[PDB]
Design a protein around this ligand. Structure first.
Ligand SMILES: [Mg+2]
Lengths: 1316, 200, 50, 251, 66, 50
RNA sequence: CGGAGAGGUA
């Protein structure tokens, strides 16, 4: 029931909702998408197989040989990921594919084979995602974020009324195919439906109508309703449907069957239509003006002379009807036109259309498509037939057809990848309906319209782009003759594939450097949802419509966690339970609500299907059956929330924390914060620095273990068993006898990563948490990585805080930090920097790194060896020498000015062929010794495991306690044992030990070769040396530290212990925050966390009291049981009677520093539970205590809040930020000082700061800040001399960057000069 | 339509396939496309007697269309041949394209010179530049302009060496004149015989 | 929205009311960012006319 | 300029001038040859196009391209816009004797003085220290004084307390919106790394203490120090210019 | 408006260091204009004293000298 | 071979570059004439053309 | 002290 890592320290879980679906693997998007990329696909629709079947088989141009594809297989990486990070080479795998080349013999007719060759050709190096989600491209670990772009399909958008200023909205429709030419219909303010293709010239839409072989008659039949007139004995009798008169005004006496139904001047009432239906009317006598404006449907030819009376789509009139009736025409068909319901948007376009048939329509489409090129028949018909109806030059994807048929109210979400006739007709009908108001436009930022294009899809796209170039090269090379001598690999070059996959993985707008100063920062950078990138919107041209959180974001995208600043909401982050659909849309889990019972079946609803049903709220109280306790529950119907009946609901939310991300699910009491402060809390919790010793949060949200385990920072056991040898650098696990495999049993080894350097220059180092001789299970955390404590996220330290103003040292947002905080060595963080020195190949000979340099004392060469490289472990300070280098005529790598630290790792690279120096050689000798020690220690530990299993199976069938030790372990086969299956098992294990012996003799030489192999470097250099400094940046006034609820602030004083406000017991407060930051920034969650942390440390202090004095295990057991009780019907329910009286003494050993508390995000601990838990300890249940002053020794009246707030130290130090400059380098084209801190640069006194001096009277100060201090070199040298000579006086002169301007205008045809 | 334009006029067609292995196929492919033609092949790897056999058949109009490689670059020009069709104008020297474009005519019959190219994405960028270079400057006296545009496309090769038409960064014109006058002085000075002359 | 968030910050906020509060805050933040971008050019235009 | 790898930077103006010179030399030779009119006409056309590309590229639609599918930076492209000479290198420019650091509170200060770290104060006022060390006779050159300041003996802190004494520095925040965004302040030397800022002026600076950084400029001449003390000192800006009401309100 | 009233200034530097530099340079180079350095911006460009504060007395002296 | 079925002879030359020839063209195949059916060498297909 | 791209602080 409890894993052994979770029996060490059981986090007391508050919260009352029983969870029905565990959190998924938090990196499911990256891992599952890329395993959708590289996997053998028998169905052949995903990844590399789909690309190969899409391109191959390829025909030669002469049509005599095709090159076809059989199967593919990923090879093995020549380097491991640690070595890839060390050497600076891509972690890639070879792509070995079996192409098959046929040859057709010229004698026999088309289709015959002479010879058919088939070999495995090497093409490309595709990088492999590591077992976390991160690629290694050049040793810089890059993460590829998913993209949120428009799904190909049909979009009915509109202007809101923002063109041509008449207030008319212009409803437009647009077909966006996945691959092909776009189409879009739009309106003109003259109510004309026009067509255009790929934003070319704008044609009448009836041209595209005719081009599909539609006559005018078919157009009017499809796009309009008919009205039947009949000339008879009196008047033009006309057949009428009752509903046709809705919303018109009566213009005559509407009379039928001798009954005057409607009088003129009346709006046709609902009663009119009802009485017309009741009286069973069909026919109306209409006057002659009721045809005088209406328009005929069909062209009417003479029944005798065969001549056309009225053209198609022509308005009837008086004499027109007379000539129609004198030709014996009895039936008249008319367009059911309106002004509000069925407008004449097609007829007017037919009138403005200058084209009368299909062929001239195709010619018009040609002349719009291609200027020039006088069209023919076959050219135009071919262009139109392959413009939208070719499977190869136009293709909606399967997602494209899905969106197309879904948005057009169809049912078949499968179909052809091309357009058709009825598709375009349905689009046109939908656009006309939207103009009529029936049907509505589609908002673009709806998550049913936006699609997740993850790493698998983008890499497959770039690989297909790489393949199509190889396709052309193979095509032309096969077109080249003499094909019998050649082979696959000769025509097909690997370079296009590798180049076009490397320009994606290396330098793309979405393959970005990994934020790697946390476990949380990694695991929430691998789930970002960028709206930018190729095929997406631009960063600085995104309106407020995109940046708002749409009501579809619930459950799919976190609404709070997003960066603030220039891109708010463009870089959204995924929610906890959200997944990607089979088409790419974001779907979220829900519980299916049956007749009245909330069941436990989980339906993943997408963003479109959600709008039809109604979904309950995450916390709507049901009691033990799935029946809601309330008969009016809060629900979400369609992009909007309401109050619904207890039987009307369809779905419940899965868990109370499905709205938020993983970065904002670790904020306790999130339901009490604001959303601005929750945004700031998530965005700064993403920045915390892993401190020296990790310290658990006393108030978590129970999500800490998921974040620690799911990210790859911890070292977690693959198979359970018993630990056999724990070092600070490795962990050996002897497997249990049941999970272990039959052949090559062995025991598992976890080589922990020691003090290596993260991407953000922080220290990541796994350290073991399991002691020797200790059982572990499958999924048990063995080693805690950077900022983890016993396998749960511990980003910062939990600190005793008091909320009061203290002499203004915490004035605005500042923090007053006790000196006990820096004494206890808790916020001091390691920072590892990497300095590289290069040995260029240059004129007058390359550079030698040997120690001999001129104009140096021996103190500058005290630490460097004979070879010119500083020893490992030598404390350097700013200005020292790490690697001495010479100018061929002091080009040494010096420590930058200001940084201390210890040199902890020196690595040397060298091109193959260049001889190495003595310290270089000893580095490879230690590397050979280390690799041989690793392989040989692996070999002998595996020998011990194999022989331990050999002795374990020897218990039955040939047991020999003393005979087995008469000969050594090697000859453990030919002893006394009956020739049965057990001897076969002994043969298996011993012959596989022999296999391990062979593995030694090859693997050792392979590693020896790898160590002595020269490494590829960029041309120009010879040898590269990298020195790794380790600094311990502790804390000082200035280091910006924050909390979890968005309460940032630099610290303003390191106050000594006795000055700190101490309580009635004598314990000094460690941090004095400010109360004034709580009301105006409504983050009440920090006060609630302060109280809960006070309660937790009270419980931990009581356990520490019962442990410091020795008390029997019954007392501790009873108190811990009381503590794990007292929730208001919580779901934790841990029972201590199953604990074996030893693990209680370890549980209460881990609980002596405060009893950790879980507060799930929106189902947290109420106030009553906090008061009760404070009451269990001997603390005052009001949260606040009386707190004595430190200096005056008297009492702070108005008793103040103390507690245990969990504070982080962010990565905005003050050693990084402080900078100053008197005189240094100067820029070249313009003699202004350089800019930056890396460059020794001066601050920019910009435009606004110049206005800030013009607004004063400071003319002289301004004059020197833009002539003397900066720009006039003849002025600044003399100013330096004057300052040194004690005389403060400027001779200003003329700024040089105005002479630069003068020359750059004078170098045009403009004479600009200075007068007298 | 180009082939029937030249045939029903009464003149031969220079079909330029520029390949030896596939030209045999292209013969019957063109024959199937154009039944109204009398097609035969001639290329440089024929036995050099059948080649002149085909040429002396071609002077006497016994067959219209001659699918042929660039042996006609030398040209044996007849009066009736008046339409050259390049099958792959993608890869050809610009000088070669102009020269073959000059192989037709020599009569009062208005000639044509089609330059069939592959898909505009398929051809290389230098192939593109050659194609607008030949398409644009089309008039009388375009021989010099085409070579002038060929320069700065390929770049003048190294001045003092072999290997015309290369974009190399070798010695400039200023240094070359200096070397030449220095050589003139050192030669005219002391009695120094010529290099190649002492090769005698 | 016709249903106001009926709970203060001392009591909790359930999921839906927090979603609506999140919308309001995101609108405020985006408006602040692009508003600063708009105001800088305005004060530049006034400075270089007076 | 070189990119350290045996090559040189592009410097697009050189490419445009090279095109113009090439075309002009071609035209000169063609005029010396009495060439036919069509070829010299084409060469004069392409010369005119080269001149239009050099003077103002991008006024024509076909912007000339050197690499990266990127239009070249012409002569007129070095003047217009945010990155031209006028707005980037002339109106506002980078300055010597300047520094930048995170700010904290320090509420013991008086209204006219601000904290200043010892390292920053030694680094801005380095020429003043050199002058005083040559005056005291402790280093009879600039090199020995430079070594002394680089070593930080216990005499240079006395020299600082002699040269800080009544020498205002200008504190500045990043979005300097109004004229109370640059204010003079007498320095007090601090054994820290943050610029302590008297908390009455955080209303004028709009400066919360949650990670803001401020820049320290140093007025050199006597006119500038007197301008700072008489116009820009914090004890003179207690009434805002936008309204008569105070701006040093207890916050 | 402040845009057009800033561009239609009598001093072409005060209208060229504002937006739309190239049109100001052409229109003020054809007409052969002259800039007398009156505003507080062109003196910033050419790096002499501001004629507002402590530099106002200096500019008064320079105006009375000629 | 493009929509037709066929039966062929698998020949594994050096480096396992497979070659097939149809059973119809069996007359392109001979037994090894060196008498070294347990000592025969293994050519590569077509040779090093490029 | 070239350019492009990606982030981040106020
Ligand atoms: Mg701030």
């Amino acid at each position: 029931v409890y894993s052994y890592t979770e029996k060490k320290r059981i986090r007391k879980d508050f919260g009352k909702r029983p969870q029905v679906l565990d959190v998924p693997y938090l990196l499911s998007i990256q891992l599952d998408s890329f395993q959708k990329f590289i996997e053998q696909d028998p169905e052949g629709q995903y990844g590399l197989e789909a690309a190969f079947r899409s391109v191959f088989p390829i025909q030669s141009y002469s049509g005599n040989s095709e090159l076809q594809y059989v199967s593919y297989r990923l090879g093995e990486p020549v380097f491991d990921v640690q070595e890839c990070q060390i050497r600076g080479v891509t972690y890639s795998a070879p792509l070995r594919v079996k192409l098959r080349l046929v040859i057709y013999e010229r004698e026999a007719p088309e289709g015959t084979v002479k010879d058919i060759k088939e070999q495995e050709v090497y093409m490309g190096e595709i990088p492999l995602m590591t077992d976390n989600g991160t690629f290694v491209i050049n040793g810089t670990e890059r993460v590829i974020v998913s993209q949120l772009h428009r799904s190909p399909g049909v979009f009915f958008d509109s202007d809101k009324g923002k063109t041509h200023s008449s207030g008319k909205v212009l409803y437009n429709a647009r077909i966006i195919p996945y691959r092909g030419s776009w189409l879009d219909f739009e309106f003109d303010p003259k109510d004309n439906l026009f067509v255009r293709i790929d934003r070319r010239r704008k044609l009448p839409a009836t041209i595209i109508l005719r081009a599909l072989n539609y006559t005018t008659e078919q157009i009017l039949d499809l796009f309009f309703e008919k009205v039947i007139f009949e000339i008879r004995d009196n008047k033009l009798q006309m057949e009428l449907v009752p509903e046709r008169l809705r919303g018109e005004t009566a213009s005559f006496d509407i009379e039928a069957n001798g009954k005057v139904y409607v009088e003129k001047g009346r709006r046709i009432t609902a009663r009119h239509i009802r009485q017309l239906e009741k009286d069973d009317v069909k026919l109306i006598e209409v006057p002659v003006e009721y045809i005088a404006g209406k328009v005929v449907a069909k062209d009417y030819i003479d029944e005798s002379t065969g001549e056309l009376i009225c053209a198609a789509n022509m308005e009837l009139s008086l004499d027109l009807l007379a000539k129609l009736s004198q030709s014996g025409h009895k039936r008249i068909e008319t367009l059911f036109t309106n002004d509000l319901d069925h407008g004449p948007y097609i007829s007017e376009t037919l009138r403005v259309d200058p084209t009368n048939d299909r062929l001239s329509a195709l010619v018009e489409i040609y002349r719009m498509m291609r200027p020039g090129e006088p069209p023919t028949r076959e050219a135009a018909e071919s262009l139109f037939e392959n413009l939208f109806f070719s499977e190869d030059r136009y293709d909606l994807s399967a997602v494209g057809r899905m969106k197309f048929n879904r948005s057009l109210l169809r049912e078949e979400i499968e179909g052809s990848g091309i357009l058709s006739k009825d598709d375009i007709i349905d689009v046109m009908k939908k656009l006309i309906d939207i103009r009529n108001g029936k049907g509505e436009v589609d908002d673009i930022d709806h998550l049913g319209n936006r699609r997740i294009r993850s790493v698998g899809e983008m890499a497959e796209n770039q690989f297909r782009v790489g393949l199509v170039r190889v396709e052309r090269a193979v095509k032309e090379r096969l077109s080249l003759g003499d094909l019998d001598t050649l082979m696959p690999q000769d025509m097909i070059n690997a370079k296009p594939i590798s180049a076009a996959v490397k320009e994606f993985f290396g330098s793309s707008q979405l393959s970005q450097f990994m934020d790697q100063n946390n476990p949380l920062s990694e695991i929430t950078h691998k789930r970002r949802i960028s709206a930018l990138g190729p095929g997406g919107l631009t960063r600085e041209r995104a309106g407020f419509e995109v940046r708002d959180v749409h009501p579809t974001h619930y459950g799919r995208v976190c609404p709070i966690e997003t960066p603030e600043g220039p891109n708010i909401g463009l870089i959204n982050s995924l929610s906890v339970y959200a997944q990607t659909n089979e088409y790419g849309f974001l779907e979220t889990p829900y519980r299916k609500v049956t007749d009245g019972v909330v069941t436990d079946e989980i339906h993943y609803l997408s963003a479109i299907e959600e709008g039809n049903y109604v979904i309950a709220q995450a916390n709507s109280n049901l009691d033990e059956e799935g029946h809601f306790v309330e008969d009016l529950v809060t629900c979400r119907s369609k992009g909007e929330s309401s109050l619904f009946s207890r039987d009307q609901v369809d779905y419940m939310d899965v868990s109370t924390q499905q709205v938020v991300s993983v970065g904002a699910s670790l904020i306790p009491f999130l339901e009490h914060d604001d959303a601005n402060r929750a945004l700031m809390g998530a965005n700064m919790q993403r920045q915390a620095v892993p401190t020296l010793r990790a310290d658990k949060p006393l108030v978590g949200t129970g999500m800490e273990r998921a974040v620690a385990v799911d990210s790859g920072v911890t070292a977690v056991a693959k198979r359970g068993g018993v630990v056999q040898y724990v070092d600070a650098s490795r962990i050996v696990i002897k497997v249990n006898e049941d999970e272990m495999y039959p052949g090559e049993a062995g025991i598992d080894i976890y080589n922990l990563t020691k003090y290596t350097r993260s991407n953000q220059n922080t220290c990541i180092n796994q350290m073991p948490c399991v002691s020797l001789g200790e059982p572990v299970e499958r999924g048990d955390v063995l080693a805690d990585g950077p900022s983890t404590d016993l396998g749960e996220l511990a980003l910062g330290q939990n600190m005793r805080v008091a909320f009061m103003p203290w002499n203004g040292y915490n004035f605005e947002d500042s923090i007053l930090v006790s000196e006990r905080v820096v004494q206890e060595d808790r916020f001091t963080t390691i920072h590892i920097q990497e300095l590289a020195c290069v040995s260029r190949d240059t004129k007058l000979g390359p550079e030698e790194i040997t120690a001999d340099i001129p104009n140096v004392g021996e103190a500058a060469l005290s630490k460097l060896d004979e070879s010119g490289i500083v020893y490992i472990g030598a404390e350097v300070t700013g200005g020292d020498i790490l690697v001495g280098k010479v100018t061929p005529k002091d080009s040494s790598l010096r420590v930058p000015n200001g940084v201390s630290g210890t040199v902890i790792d020196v690595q040397v690279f060298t091109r193959d062929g260049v001889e190495k120096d003595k310290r270089a050689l000893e580095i490879e000798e230690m590397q050979l010794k280390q690799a041989k020690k690793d392989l040989s220690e692996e070999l002998q530990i595996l020998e011990a495991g194999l022989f331990s299993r050999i002795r374990a199976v020897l218990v039955a069938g040939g047991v020999e306690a003393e005979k087995l030790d008469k000969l050594p372990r090697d000859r453990w086969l030919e002893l006394g044992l009956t020739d049965e299956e057990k001897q076969n098992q002994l043969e298996q294990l011993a012959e596989q030990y022999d296999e391990l012996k062979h593995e030694f003799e090859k693997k050792l030489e392979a590693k020896r070769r790898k160590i002595t192999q020269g490494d590829d470097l960029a041309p120009g250099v010879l040898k590269i040396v990298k020195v790794y400094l380790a600094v311990k940046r502790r804390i000082q006034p200035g280091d910006k530290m924050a909390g979890r609820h968005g309460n940032k602030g630099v610290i303003s004083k390191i106050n000594p212990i006795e000055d700190m406000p101490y309580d009635e017991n004598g314990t000094p407060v460690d941090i004095v925050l400010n109360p004034l930051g709580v009301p105006s920034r409504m983050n009440i969650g920090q006060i609630l966390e302060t109280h809960l942390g006070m309660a937790a440390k009270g419980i931990g202090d009581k356990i520490n009291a019962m442990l410091k004095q020795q008390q029997e295990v019954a007392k501790l057991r009873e108190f811990i049981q009381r503590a794990y009780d007292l929730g208001a019907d919580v779901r934790q329910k841990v029972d201590l009677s199953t604990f074996s009286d030893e693990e209680v003494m370890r549980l209460a050993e881990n609980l002596r520093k405060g009893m950790p508390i879980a507060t799930p995000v929106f189902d947290g601990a109420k106030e009553a539970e906090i008061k009760e838990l404070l009451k269990l300890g001997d603390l005052p249940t009001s949260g606040q205590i009386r707190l004595y002053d430190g200096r005056t020794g008297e009492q702070f009246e108005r008793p103040v809040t103390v507690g245990y707030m969990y504070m982080l130290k962010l990565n905005h130090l003050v050693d990084d930020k402080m900078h100053a400059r008197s005189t240094g380098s100067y820029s070249l084209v313009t003699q202004q000082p350089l800019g930056g801190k890396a460059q020794f640069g001066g601050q920019r006194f910009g435009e606004m700061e110049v206005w800030a001096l013009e607004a004063y009277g400071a003319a002289y100060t301004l004059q020197e800040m833009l002539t003397v201090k900066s720009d006039d070199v003849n002025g600044r040298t003399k100013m330096y001399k004057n300052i040194v000579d004690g005389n403060h006086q400027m001779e200003p002169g003329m700024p040089e960057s105005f002479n630069v301007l003068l020359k750059e205008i004078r170098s045009l045809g403009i004479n600009i000069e200075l007068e007298d | 339509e180009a082939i029937l334009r030249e045939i029903l006029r009464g003149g031969q067609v220079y079909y330029l396939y520029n390949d030896v292995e596939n030209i045999q196929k292209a013969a019957e492919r063109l024959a199937e496309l154009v039944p109204e033609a009398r097609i035969a092949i001639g290329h440089g790897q024929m036995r050099e007697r059948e080649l002149e056999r085909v040429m002396n058949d071609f002077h006497h109009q016994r067959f219209n269309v001659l699918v042929c490689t660039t042996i006609i670059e030398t040209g044996i020009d007849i009066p009736t041949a008046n339409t050259i069709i390049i099958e792959r104008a993608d890869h050809f020297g610009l000088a070669q394209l102009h020269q073959l474009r000059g192989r037709v005519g020599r009569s009062h019959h208005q000639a044509y010179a089609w330059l069939l190219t592959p898909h505009p994405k398929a051809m290389t960028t230098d192939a593109q530049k050659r194609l607008e270079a030949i398409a644009s400057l089309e008039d009388l006296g375009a021989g010099f302009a085409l070579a002038t545009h060929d320069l700065e496309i390929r770049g003048a090769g190294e001045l003092l060496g072999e290997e015309q038409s290369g974009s190399m960064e070798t010695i400039g014109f200023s240094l070359y004149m200096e070397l030449l006058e220095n050589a003139v002085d050192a030669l005219k000075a002391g009695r120094e015989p010529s290099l190649e002359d002492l090769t005698s | 929205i016709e249903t106001p968030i009926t709970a203060n910050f001392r009591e909790g906020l359930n999921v839906l009311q927090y979603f609506i509060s999140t919308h309001g805050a995101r609108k405020g933040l985006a408006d602040t960012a692009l508003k600063t971008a708009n105001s800088g050019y305005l004060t530049r235009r006034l400075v270089d006319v007076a | 300029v070189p990119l350290d790898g045996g090559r040189f930077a592009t410097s697009d103006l050189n490419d445009l001038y090279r095109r113009v010179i090439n075309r002009n030399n071609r035209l000169k030779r063609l005029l010396d040859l009495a060439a036919p009119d069509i070829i010299v006409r084409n060469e004069k056309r392409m010369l005119q196009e080269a001149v239009d590309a050099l003077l103002d590229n991008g006024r024509r639609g076909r912007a000339i391209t050197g690499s990266n599918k990127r239009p070249l930076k012409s002569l007129a492209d070095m003047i217009k816009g945010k990155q031209g000479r006028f707005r980037q290198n002339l109106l506002g420019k980078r300055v010597d004797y300047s520094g930048r650091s995170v700010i904290t509170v320090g509420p013991y200060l008086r209204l006219h003085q601000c904290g200043l770290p010892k390292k920053m104060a030694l680094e801005l006022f380095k020429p003043f220290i050199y002058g005083k060390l040559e005056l005291r006779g402790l280093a009879t050159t600039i090199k020995a004084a430079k070594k002394m300041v680089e070593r930080e003996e216990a005499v240079v802190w006395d020299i600082l307390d002699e040269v800080i004494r009544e020498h205002p520095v200008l504190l500045n925040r990043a979005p300097t919106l109004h004229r109370l965004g640059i204010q003079a302040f007498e320095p007090v030397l601090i054994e820290g790394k943050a610029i302590q800022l008297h908390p009455l002026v955080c209303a004028a600076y709009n400066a919360d203490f949650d990670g803001d950084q401020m820049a320290v400029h140093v007025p050199l001449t006597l006119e500038a120090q007197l301008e700072a003390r008489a116009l820009m000192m914090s004890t003179n800006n207690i009434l805002s210019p936008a309204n008569g009401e105070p701006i040093i309100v207890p916050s | 408006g402040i845009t057009k009233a800033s561009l239609a200034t009598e001093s072409f530097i005060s209208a060229a260091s504002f937006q739309e530099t190239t049109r100001v340079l052409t229109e003020a180079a054809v007409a052969g204009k002259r800039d007398e350095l009156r505003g507080l911006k062109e003196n910033v460009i050419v790096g002499r004293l501001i004629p507002a504060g402590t530099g106002y007395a200096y500019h008064q002296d320079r105006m009375r000298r000629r | 071979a493009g929509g037709i079925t066929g039966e062929y002879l698998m020949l594994t030359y050096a480096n396992d570059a497979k070659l097939y020839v149809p059973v119809s063209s069996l007359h392109l195949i001979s037994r090894y004439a060196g008498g070294a059916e347990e000592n025969a060498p293994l050519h590569k297909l077509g040779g090093d053309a490029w």
